[PDB]
Amino acid sequence: QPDLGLTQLFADPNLIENLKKNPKTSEMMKDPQLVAKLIGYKQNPQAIGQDLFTDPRLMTIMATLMGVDLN
Structure with a gap:
């Protein structure tokens, strides 16, 4: 119920690609530099929560992952 998935989902290998095509989250990948910054933050810092x-x-990214990427 609270929040959604967590660091494990994105901390995994390249999960942003999926995020690129079906979720609105892909907006950040194509424009803001924060994407790179976040990539490091996905690997070592559980602080993402x-x-x-x-x-x-x-x-939103969490939603897709936790939503089975269906709905």
């Missing part, structure tokens, strides 16, 4: 609060779109 607290950053979702600061990053609105990151939550």
Whole structure:
């Protein structure tokens, strides 16, 4: 119920590609530099759980992953 997925989903290997085609989250990949910054943040810092609060779109990414990428 609370929040959505977590660091594990994106911390995994290239998960942004999926994020590119079916979720609105792909907007950040094509424009903001934050994507690169986040990539490092996906690998080592479990702290992402607290950053979702600061990053609105990151939550959308969680939705797709947690939603089985169906709906």
